[PDB]
Every structure is written in C-alpha cells, then in structure tokens.
Amino acid sequence: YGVYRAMKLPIYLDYSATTPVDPRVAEKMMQFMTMDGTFGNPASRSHRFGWQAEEAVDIARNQIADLVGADPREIVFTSGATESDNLAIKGAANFYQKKGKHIITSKTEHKAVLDTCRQLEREGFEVTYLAPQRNGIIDLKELEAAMRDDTILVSIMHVNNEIGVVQDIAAIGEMCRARGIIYHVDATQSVGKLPIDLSQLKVDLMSFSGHKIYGPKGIGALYVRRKPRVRIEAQMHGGGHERGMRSGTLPVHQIVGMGEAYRIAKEEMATEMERLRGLRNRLWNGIKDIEEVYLNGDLEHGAPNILNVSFNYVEGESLIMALKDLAVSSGSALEPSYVLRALGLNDELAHSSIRFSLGRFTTEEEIDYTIELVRKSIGRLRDLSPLWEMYKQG
Amino acid sequence: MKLPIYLDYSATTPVDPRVAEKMMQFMTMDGTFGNPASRSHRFGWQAEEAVDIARNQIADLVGADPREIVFTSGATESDNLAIKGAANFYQKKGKHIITSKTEHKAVLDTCRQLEREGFEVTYLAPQRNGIIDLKELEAAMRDDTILVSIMHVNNEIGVVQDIAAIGEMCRARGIIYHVDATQSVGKLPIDLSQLKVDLMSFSGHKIYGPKGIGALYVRRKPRVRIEAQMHGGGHERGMRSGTLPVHQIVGMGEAYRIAKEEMATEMERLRGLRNRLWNGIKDIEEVYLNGDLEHGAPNILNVSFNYVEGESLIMALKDLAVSSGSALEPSYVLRALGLNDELAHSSIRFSLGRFTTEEEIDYTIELVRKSIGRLRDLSPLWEMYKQGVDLNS
Ligand SMILES: *Cc1c(COP(=O)(O)O)cnc(C)c1O
Ligand SMILES: *Cc1c(COP(=O)(O)O)cnc(C)c1O
C-alpha cells in the first residue's frame, strides 16, 4: 500500500495529550488578532471595537452551549480544563462549606481534580478517594455508602484520559440530585466525543477544554447550572467578570477558536466517532492475540479513541524506545501511571503500558503499521528476558 | 483617515503581524502543535523548545533569568497568584498587606478576598497627582507587614511610581514587594537584576501580543516563594499547573523580543504625540490633567473637563475609541485622586500606540475643542461660570 509505505514517522497517536488545531478553527481565530481584524476588548463598552468583540464572544458562547445542551449564560470561560476543575471544586467547596465539608472523588481522576482536593484537605475539607474496579468503573454502591448528610460535592469524570473508561454520569447525577449533592463532571475527554445534553443530565458543574477537540490550547469553560441553581466562589478576582465567577480579559481569538471547534464537533461528531471506533477495534484485534497482553478499561463501553494496553514480560522503558516510530504515552511521571496502579496493576505491568489515542488524521494504514510494529517489538523484546522463558515453563 | 480613531491601546492592543505570523506555526498538523509536557516523543520535545525560547525572550526584556518566569493566563492571574501566593506562603510571619487605592481591580479585589480570609490590608491614598507619598508608605510598614503591592504604571492615568525606591524600602525591612507592570513592560525600562522587586506581573496584550497569556516574575535571588493557586500536576516548578499554550507563549515571546528592539524609538515617538495632544487641549478653559506628565507613561493622557456631562462627552467624541473608566459609577481611581463625581465622570483616557499618527492627534485636538465648546453652550452652568460658582462642587 502506497500510504503505508510512504508513511510519515513518527505517527501521532497521542491525541489525548493534545490535538492539532483544525484549519477552519485557525482561519476563524486569525480574524480576531491584528489591526485589520476584530482585536478589541469586549469589556470596552463605550465604542465599536469593544461591541464587535463582545458580539463574537457571544456567538462562540452559544456555539459551546449548543453542543452540550446548555444556555450560554451557564458557560464561564476559563484558561483551560485545569482551571475549570480548580474553579468548580474550590468554588463549590468554599461556597457550600457551612452545609458540610465532605467531598467524594475517584482515585483515577486527572491531577487537576486530585491535587485540588489535596489542597482542600490542607484547608480542612475531608475527601474520600474512591477506588475503581479493575475495569476502571466506580462501583455505584460504594459511592452511595460514602455519601453522608454533610457531603457537599462529588467529582467523577466522564471519560478517563489514561484508559478511556466511561463513568455512568447520568446515574451518578441522579444519586447526587436526590440527596442535594453538587455533582461536578470533568468532561475534557468526552466533550465532542460522546453525546452530552445538560437539559437532561443531572450534572451541576462541568469542565471542558478546547485542545482535546481540535481547538486551541489555553482556553476552556466551566458549565455552571442555572436550574436548579448552583453557586460557586470565584477563585480569580479583578472586576467580577463572567457574572462574578471568573475575572480577567476575554481572549476573543481563543474563545472564537473554541466556539468554532464545538460548532464543528456537533456537525461531524457522529460520523467521526464511528470511524474512530472502527479504527480502535481494528488496532485491538491486531494485537489482542499477542500472548500476555491486557486491555485496561472497557472495549465496548470505552471512548472510541483511547486504547490503553499492558504488555507482560517486557520492560517499560525499552518498550517506549522500541515504539519510537509512534508518538504515544505510557502515563509515566520514574513513577508509573497512578491510574493503572489504582486498577491494581503491579508497578512493572503499569510501566509497560501504552496509551494509543486516535484522532482525525489517523488512518487504517497507520493502524496496520502500528499493529505490525507492536507485534514485532514485543516479540523482539521478550527474547531479552529469561522471565519470558520462565513464563513459558511455570 | 479611518473613523473611529483607536485611542484605547490601554484596554488592549492589536497583535503585531510578526507576532501573529509566529503563532500560526504552532497550531495545525503541519506545524508544532504538540504538548510540551509530552516527554516521550518529538512532538513534545519540539514544543518544549519553542516554549523555552519564548521564556528566554520575556526574561531578556526585563533583565531576569527564564527560571524566574512563571506563565499564567494574563496579568489578572499573575496579580492573583503573586498576592495570594505570597500572602499564604508568608502568613506565619504576619498578615499585614499594604497596597494603593488606585491599583487595578486584579490587586484590589484580590486584597478584598484576603481580608475575608483574615488578612489586614492598608489601602494608601495617593496624592492629587496619583503618586504615593513614600513617607506614608513607611509610616504604614510594621513588623508584621509581609507584602506591599504598588503598580509601575497606572492603567487609567498613566502615573509612574518610584518602584526602585519602594523596592529598597521593602528589601531593607524584609517585606515582599510585588509590582503590577502590565502597563509598563515594553514602555519603560525594567532590569530586575538591578531593581529590588520580588514579584512582577505582565501581560501580552498591552504590547501587541495575544490576549489570554501572561507571566509572573518570581525572584530566585534573594529567593522568594509563593503558594500555587492552580493545582494539577505541579507545572511551572510547582507554581502554576496546566497545559502550556504554546502558540500563545510563542506570541508573547515574539512581542517581547520586538519590544526590546523597538521600545526606545517608539516610546519617544509616543511621548511626542502625548505632548502634542495635551498642548492642543490645555488651552481649553477648566480642564485638568489627571496624573503627572513628568512621572507619567509616554502613551497615556487622562483629562477631566469641567462643566460638561460625562455621558454627553463620550457620545460627542464618538469619532474616537477612548475610555472614561466608568462602570454608572465614575472611575474609582479618579475618586481616589480626590475629584468630585461629575468631574470624574467627564474624564477621558486617551491611550496611544503603534498606529497613532500626528494627523489623528490633530483631528482629536479639534474634535475635543469644538465638542467641549458645544457642550458648555447647553445648560446655564457655564454661563454662570463668571457669576461666582456657589460653594462646593
Ligand atoms: C487534558 C486534561 C485536563 C487538563 O486540561 P487543560 O485544558 O490542558 O488544562 C483535565 N482533565 C482531563 C480529563 C484531561 O484530559
Ligand atoms: C489590563 C491590566 C490588567 C489585566 O490584565 P489581563 O491580561 O487583561 O488579565 C491588570 N493590571 C493592569 C495595570 C492592567 O492595565
């Protein structure tokens, strides 16, 4: 095959770390920057440079709200999903603290949630970190058992960024609503990938980013429910912008880019995620019959774009080196993935795990190249430990 | 020319096309779009290189080590981080903070939040010209004072504080000194290897770089420390977690590179225009300069006009994109200088920049002269002005 043979290397399989900006998004962004464009500050209320800028912000705010079934007034712009996570959890925790100081989250949450919760523990909040099941799913009966009268907040993400597992955010939402608990979802990896309708879903706070959906880095949003009303304390002060919730200049060009990505995503999501899901199954089929490999997560109920695989009887660092033709991630920090460790894998298996994440430039030929490279590489490397021979005995 | 004339560069500036050109290379599939935290592949390594180059360009303008530069989302974030970060870090030493009534709201609203948290804040009144009396700063400084925040250039009236002298007083007493340099960076010279400032805020969009990126300088010698306000992975050496927006960072870097080359020439040109503007309007009766021309940024002119209504003034000048600093409450900075509410209302900030010409200044002088004349012709207030304006207003 012509594509397969003239294959540009390394192959990008790390869309979960960041995505390339869609050419249409970039083109929109370019009109909101120079003296010839709409470069005004939306907060300049006294002249047309400002009004024009405010208008482009309101369009983008509607574009974002339309994807996720919210009212634009529920969308608070932030500098990214890290900030959204900080704002949601510290904002709600501080606002509702006289009602209770107990927070429940998952051990497999992104660090923006975990380190936030750890900071709140310093401040006197008490935090339950729930252990997931081996597949990454939180046991909903364990969640209910942890819920108390002084529980103010639960934070559990839609799609796990390391392993792609999908939590039942609707059921968790129902549990929280019935008890009067604020439910925050980190939807950074699910927005524009799985359907989200906040007019139906019982979620109070939701974090999104631009750069996991072909928008620019350094912009995000937090959805803050108007009905039934949830409040949060601003963490960023300076003029009470975004209805008191987040002060600072609105980076119009960034906001316009995010809105455009979310407009694109609503239109192209269903065809593209079907295509991606086909490609992920194609990848897993090719590699599942290598002996002693393990899928981390859920094949049928996972995100269409993430495949996290553990390879037994090989050494983690030489694995990444063997796969240098691919841009991938092991989740290493050398600490292995705290997420894999939470599922209960030993450190060495956790080290020799690879997240493959797919996106809109990913082809069938890249997948086939990947399959043959993984197969070759695992065979070659296992020929280097006696443990593999000492597996092929007992 | 083109109407309306942009004279609101202090609100935001247009991105320099050199800056935009660089940013465009760090975005799409055929450019450098990777995440610099992606440590295991070249998409990350090449993004990390661009960030390091940008960080070096920023540090070079201001006389710092790049390791002292912490990236943030803007000067609002840098201000919040510096003050809350230093106040929380040093709170066992004391809980007293001194700032100025005329600071940006990013400082003032931050200090008000810290008051809720049990900190004590002194807000110093400036002099009628906007300058802080250093004798009153000194009088306010105690054994339990941990932090002072006094901006370099005021965004509303352009007044320049003696940040070097303030820095000396703070260092001599073991007090942390934070400077909001959002309006001075790329306009006045800053050399942090000489200047005794511990924390310094800057932005990209006040010097022809993109909105939504900024930095905080955090001194490493003698070492200053702050508590992170943004958690999630301990990035920027623990001080600010989150993904590094590489195209934004590259734009800011490039804006700061350009500013180092072009600053001296451009600020001389702007000071000329600022002076040209003031000369043309100073011989209108009953107008007041807010600030101090001698201790004032080269690109800002803030003027109050007596005997006109503020709302009518700004509409009369619709040929200009300017600011009156209203919110309708008048400018809190002007109220802090001592002006009555009406005079504060009928004040205009003219801020100049890269595209401002002598033709635009001349048009502005004429427009202003004619407009004030017209306005004072309505209402017998101006007509009375003669009759012995009956006391107190
Ligand atoms: C990427 C990621 C974040 C951080 O997002 P930024 O916009 O880069 O700060 C938070 N949560 C999840 C699930 C993520 O994948
Ligand atoms: C504009 C400005 C800010 C706010 O900076 P952003 O980058 O827009 O958040 C803070 N301080 C001063 C003096 C400013 O003029």
Side-chain angles (χ1 to χ4, degrees), chain A residues 1-29 31-371 373-388 391-392 394, chain B residues 1-382 385-393:
Chain A
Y1 200 145
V3 165
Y4 184 96
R5 195 197 38 182
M7 181 85 61
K8 205 157 158 187
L9 302 168
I11 295 162
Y12 196 69
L13 294 166
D14 207 21
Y15 286 85
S16 278
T18 207
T19 63
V21 179
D22 189 311
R24 301 113 105 185
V25 169
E27 192 192 344
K28 246 67 217 264
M29 290 176 66
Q31 301 156 34
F32 297 88
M33 292 175 73
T34 69
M35 188 74 177
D36 298 325
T38 304
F39 70 92
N41 189 331
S44 293
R45 297 272 346 132
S46 65
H47 60 250
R48 191 190 187 256
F49 294 92
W51 314 327
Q52 211 83 33
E54 178 175 45
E55 191 182 306
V57 166
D58 189 53
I59 286 164
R61 204 190 291 272
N62 279 276
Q63 286 170 155
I64 287 152
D66 288 337
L67 214 213
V68 301
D71 181 278
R73 280 136 39 160
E74 291 174 299
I75 302 302
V76 172
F77 285 114
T78 67
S79 69
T82 299
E83 175 177 9
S84 298
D85 282 346
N86 284 70
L87 208 212
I89 301 168
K90 294 169 182 170
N94 277 280
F95 189 94
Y96 295 105
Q97 73 182 283
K98 275 169 167 162
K99 172 160 305 145
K101 304 250 267 157
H102 181 239
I103 301 164
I104 304 167
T105 196
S106 161
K107 286 162 95 285
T108 53
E109 293 291 305
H110 178 101
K111 290 298 206 198
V113 169
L114 296 177
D115 291 349
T116 288
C117 287
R118 184 157 52 74
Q119 172 64 31
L120 291 169
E121 293 182 270
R122 277 188 42 81
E123 295 173 11
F125 290 82
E126 102 157 54
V127 186
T128 304
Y129 300 94
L130 290 180
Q133 299 158 174
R134 174 60 182 84
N135 60 351
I137 294 287
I138 305 293
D139 179 351
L140 296 194
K141 299 135 42 52
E142 263 159 54
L143 174 60
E144 175 191 324
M147 285 174 166
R148 323 191 304 239
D149 285 315
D150 63 326
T151 304
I152 49 157
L153 185 56
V154 172
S155 186
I156 292 166
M157 73 207 301
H158 201 183
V159 169
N160 184 95
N161 55 293
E162 284 201 40
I163 62 168
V165 79
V166 179
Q167 301 298 344
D168 192 351
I169 65 166
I172 301 161
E174 295 279 350
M175 292 180 64
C176 292
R177 187 80 103 238
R179 291 167 180 77
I181 298 164
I182 302 304
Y183 181 35
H184 167 250
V185 173
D186 186 341
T188 310
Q189 299 281 350
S190 64
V191 65
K193 288 176 185 88
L194 303 182
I196 292 166
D197 185 354
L198 269 341
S199 76
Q200 292 301 122
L201 240 36
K202 268 102 152 171
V203 171
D204 303 305
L205 305 162
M206 186 175 268
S207 303
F208 330 107
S209 202
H211 72 108
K212 310 286 167 58
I213 199 59
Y214 315 101
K217 292 174 197 62
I219 190 69
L222 177 61
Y223 163 84
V224 178
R225 183 170 288 284
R226 279 172 81 81
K227 186 212 219 93
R229 189 105 207 194
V230 174
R231 311 269 189 191
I232 56 170
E233 286 193 17
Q235 304 298 299
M236 205 90 308
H237 297 95
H241 314 114
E242 297 295 86
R243 293 197 171 78
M245 292 178 278
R246 207 286 173 162
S247 298
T249 298
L250 267 22
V252 177
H253 73 284
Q254 295 282 90
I255 283 160
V256 169
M258 190 177 170
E260 172 64 14
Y262 278 53
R263 187 199 65 82
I264 294 160
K266 194 186 174 78
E267 232 44 55
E268 303 188 347
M269 198 166 150
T271 294
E272 176 71 11
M273 295 304 136
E274 167 174 15
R275 194 191 71 91
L276 286 199
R277 194 162 212 103
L279 290 179
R280 180 175 83 116
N281 290 161
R282 190 189 183 92
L283 178 49
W284 177 242
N285 285 340
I287 80 182
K288 66 185 199 196
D289 294 321
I290 299 165
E291 258 177 284
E292 284 292 332
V293 302
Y294 306 94
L295 195 163
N296 304 303
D298 198 303
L299 181 85
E300 296 298 338
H301 312 138
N305 53 309
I306 307 171
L307 194 63
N308 188 307
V309 178
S310 290
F311 302 87
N312 222 354
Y313 311 121
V314 298
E315 197 270 312
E317 214 174 308
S318 68
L319 219 204
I320 280 267
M321 294 167 184
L323 306 176
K324 73 176 234 167
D325 288 352
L326 324 176
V328 288
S329 184
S330 76
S332 217
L334 192 55
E335 309 304 341
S337 178
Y338 68 93
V339 172
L340 297 184
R341 268 148 55 217
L343 308 182
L345 333 196
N346 73 63
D347 275 22
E348 304 94 66
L349 227 221
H351 261 287
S352 38
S353 296
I354 302 295
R355 180 183 64 196
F356 308 86
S357 49
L358 323 175
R360 73 175 210 116
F361 290 98
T362 307
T363 64
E364 277 169 9
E365 306 77 355
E366 304 187 330
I367 294 303
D368 294 347
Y369 185 96
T370 302
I371 288 161
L373 174 60
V374 172
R375 289 191 150 262
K376 275 222 260 264
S377 301
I378 292 308
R380 213 217 336 153
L381 293 172
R382 287 176 163 166
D383 282 353
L384 305 172
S385 188
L387 212 71
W388 181 243
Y391 156 71
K392 291 202 95 71
Chain B
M1 50 215 50
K2 313 176 290 174
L3 264 26
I5 296 155
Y6 197 70
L7 296 171
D8 208 20
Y9 283 86
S10 289
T12 201
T13 67
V15 175
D16 186 311
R18 289 113 101 200
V19 172
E21 189 87 334
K22 281 271 199 269
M23 298 178 59
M24 283 173 74
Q25 298 155 19
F26 295 84
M27 292 188 63
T28 66
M29 191 66 168
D30 19 65
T32 307
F33 74 93
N35 186 327
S38 292
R39 234 77 187 19
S40 59
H41 62 246
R42 205 171 47 94
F43 293 90
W45 315 328
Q46 291 214 261
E48 173 172 31
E49 285 167 43
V51 170
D52 197 53
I53 289 154
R55 201 191 298 272
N56 273 274
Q57 300 166 143
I58 292 151
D60 284 1
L61 213 214
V62 299
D65 190 298
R67 288 174 301 184
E68 294 173 303
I69 305 299
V70 171
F71 287 118
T72 70
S73 65
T76 300
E77 180 173 3
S78 309
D79 285 339
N80 281 68
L81 213 207
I83 295 166
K84 295 172 176 169
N88 284 284
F89 194 94
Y90 294 105
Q91 66 173 288
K92 269 157 168 174
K93 296 192 185 176
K95 292 192 138 217
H96 187 238
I97 302 163
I98 297 170
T99 192
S100 160
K101 283 184 160 78
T102 53
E103 291 293 299
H104 192 98
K105 293 283 206 207
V107 170
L108 296 183
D109 283 345
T110 291
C111 293
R112 181 181 54 184
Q113 175 61 27
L114 289 174
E115 283 178 291
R116 303 214 343 115
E117 294 171 25
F119 290 83
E120 187 189 307
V121 182
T122 307
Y123 303 91
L124 302 172
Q127 293 161 144
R128 168 58 185 102
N129 65 344
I131 302 284
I132 301 299
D133 185 346
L134 298 183
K135 287 181 156 193
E136 284 154 52
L137 172 49
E138 186 171 280
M141 291 177 166
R142 322 202 294 261
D143 288 318
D144 59 327
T145 310
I146 49 156
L147 179 65
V148 166
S149 180
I150 298 165
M151 79 204 293
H152 197 186
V153 164
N154 188 100
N155 51 294
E156 282 203 39
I157 69 184
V159 78
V160 178
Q161 306 294 338
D162 196 348
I163 60 152
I166 300 171
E168 302 274 352
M169 295 174 47
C170 294
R171 189 85 107 238
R173 291 163 187 77
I175 300 165
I176 304 302
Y177 183 30
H178 168 248
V179 174
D180 188 338
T182 314
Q183 295 280 347
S184 59
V185 68
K187 307 185 176 88
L188 309 186
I190 291 159
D191 178 359
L192 262 344
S193 79
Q194 287 291 108
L195 217 39
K196 294 174 181 180
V197 171
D198 301 302
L199 298 161
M200 187 177 270
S201 299
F202 10 82
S203 191
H205 75 110
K206 305 298 165 66
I207 25 84
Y208 316 105
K211 293 175 192 60
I213 190 65
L216 177 58
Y217 165 82
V218 183
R219 176 169 292 280
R220 62 184 228 79
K221 184 192 291 203
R223 171 85 82 158
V224 160
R225 296 185 200 262
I226 62 182
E227 285 195 17
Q229 301 299 304
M230 198 68 57
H231 296 91
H235 314 109
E236 298 297 89
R237 294 170 203 280
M239 290 180 273
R240 205 278 179 182
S241 300
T243 298
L244 270 23
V246 179
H247 67 295
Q248 296 278 95
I249 287 164
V250 164
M252 189 178 170
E254 173 64 16
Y256 278 56
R257 192 198 58 78
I258 300 163
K260 196 187 162 80
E261 305 301 56
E262 295 177 0
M263 208 166 140
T265 294
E266 179 66 19
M267 295 305 132
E268 234 340 279
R269 193 185 74 83
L270 295 183
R271 197 188 51 97
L273 297 171
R274 175 261 254 158
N275 290 171
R276 189 189 185 89
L277 179 52
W278 175 238
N279 282 352
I281 78 204
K282 60 194 267 283
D283 295 325
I284 299 164
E285 262 181 289
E286 287 282 347
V287 298
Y288 299 87
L289 184 57
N290 303 307
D292 187 299
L293 227 40
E294 176 77 337
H295 302 112
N299 59 309
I300 299 171
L301 196 64
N302 188 306
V303 175
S304 309
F305 308 79
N306 225 336
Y307 313 129
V308 305
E309 292 177 1
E311 207 205 326
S312 303
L313 216 214
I314 192 97
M315 251 312 187
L317 309 178
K318 86 185 213 107
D319 286 349
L320 320 176
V322 286
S323 189
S324 81
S326 277
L328 190 59
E329 299 89 15
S331 162
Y332 71 91
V333 168
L334 297 180
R335 295 200 308 281
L337 295 190
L339 323 200
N340 66 72
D341 283 24
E342 299 90 84
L343 239 203
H345 263 300
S346 71
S347 301
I348 297 293
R349 182 189 68 197
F350 308 95
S351 43
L352 319 177
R354 270 189 91 220
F355 299 96
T356 308
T357 64
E358 311 186 319
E359 307 85 286
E360 293 173 345
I361 298 296
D362 291 345
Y363 182 94
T364 301
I365 295 166
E366 296 302 308
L367 173 63
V368 172
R369 288 205 223 258
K370 291 167 182 157
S371 290
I372 298 307
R374 282 179 66 84
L375 280 179
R376 284 161 178 179
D377 280 334
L378 313 159
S379 122
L381 209 61
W382 185 237
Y385 166 71
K386 171 187 294 208
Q387 294 219 328
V389 91
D390 218 302
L391 282 155
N392 197 357
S393 174

